[PDB]
Amino acid sequence: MTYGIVIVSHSPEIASGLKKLIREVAKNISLTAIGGLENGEIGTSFDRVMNAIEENEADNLLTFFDLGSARMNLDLVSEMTDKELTIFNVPLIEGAYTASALLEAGATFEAIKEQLEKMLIEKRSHHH
Amino acid sequence: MTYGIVIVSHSPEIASGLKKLIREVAKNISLTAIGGLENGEIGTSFDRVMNAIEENEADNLLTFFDLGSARMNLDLVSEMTDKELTIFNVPLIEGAYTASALLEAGATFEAIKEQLEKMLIEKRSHHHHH
């Protein structure tokens, strides 16, 4: 089964920088990232989350996000894709980085989930 | 006693983007952010972290960081300033954002700590690069 990592942020700079941070230890994984709105402003959109999902070469996507206000769009995309999304309610940086490094190292999905379970947090924050 | 927020990342783009994200909810707080080495590499350095600390108008700094490999530098900088750093073992984005919004609203220091208590996490990742 193929796995990939998707990062969604309210900020294009967060997404960009996190992707680079991850790539320094995970050059081989299937990784996509998106942040902000089409005009570079802070936010998320259905279309841009959808594109990050569809852009990823893998069909089983471990998906990470920053603020609680992003969860809606991920859930909307989840309803409409043939990909299998696993959305994790974990910190964006620490969770995506940990998952990415494990995936790169060859960890199984169950092993990755076990580690991410330890990081579940309440994702209550919202952007206005 | 005034308080400010400091963001430290291995990435200059994460630091800048998080600052910008926070400024949408917290326009008035004393907030500084830095990431990367002087030479542009991903990482953290003593001097750049020190600059973010010294540039912050506040003397009591609630300090947030991304990966465990940043913690040593923060501890070293803490030794080398008269400012009082409170370093949180919490997620960088969600921690700094939550604390910044509370600070902006006029929450007390104890009230900020109260809300960050549920965010306490082990910060065990250590960055590498070749």
CA–CA min distance A26, chain B (Å): 10
CA dihedral angle for residue B72, residue A64, residue A18, residue A82, rounded to 10 degrees:
150
Reading the block at residue B77, the tokens are: 């900088």
Interchain CB distance below 8 Å, B25 and A127: yes
Question: What angle do helix axes A92-105 and B92-104 make, rounded to 10 degrees?
Answer: 180
Mutation target for B interface from A9, A19, A21: give the one with most B CBs within 10 A: A21
Active site residue A128: no
- The upper half-sphere exposure of residue B10, i.e. CA atoms within 13 Å in the direction of its Cβ, equals 27
DSSP SS3 for B126: coil
CA–CA min distance B92, chain A (Å): 8
Question: What angle do helix axes A92-105 and A12-23 make, rounded to 10 degrees?
Answer: 30
CATH number of domain containing B111: 3.40.50.510
Burial annotation A79-105 (CB, 10 A radius, 16+ → b, else e): eeeebebbbbebbbbbbbbbbbbbbbe
Cβ-proximal residues to A95 (8 Å cutoff; 6+ apart), any chain: A64, A88, A116, A119
Q: Is B83 exposed, middle or buried (0-12, 13-18, 19+ CB in 10 A)?
A: middle
Q: Is B6 exposed, middle or buried (0-12, 13-18, 19+ CB in 10 A)?
A: buried
The 10 Å Cβ neighbour count of residue B113 is 15
Count contacts between A and B (CB, < 8 Å): 100
The residue from B10, B126, B127, B129 that is catalytic is B10
* Alpha-carbon gap, residue B28 to B30, rounded angstroms: 7
Cβ-proximal residues to B37 (8 Å cutoff; 6+ apart), any chain: B43, B44, B45, B48
* Alpha-carbon gap, residue A18 to A7, rounded angstroms: 8
**Experimental structure resolution, Å:** 1.1
| Chain B partners within 8 Å of A97 (Cβ) | 67, 125
Domain range holding B20? 1-130
Reading the block at residue B29, the tokens are: 């707080």
| Chain A partners within 8 Å of B92 (Cβ) | 91, 93-94
DSSP conformation class of A28? S
Total domains in chain A come to 1
What amino acid occupies position A67? L
Backbone phi, then psi, for A7, in 5-degree steps? -110, 130
| Chain A partners within 8 Å of B20 (Cβ) | 11, 13, 42
The answer to whether B92 faces chain A, any CB pair under 8 Å, is yes
Determination technique for this entry:
X-ray
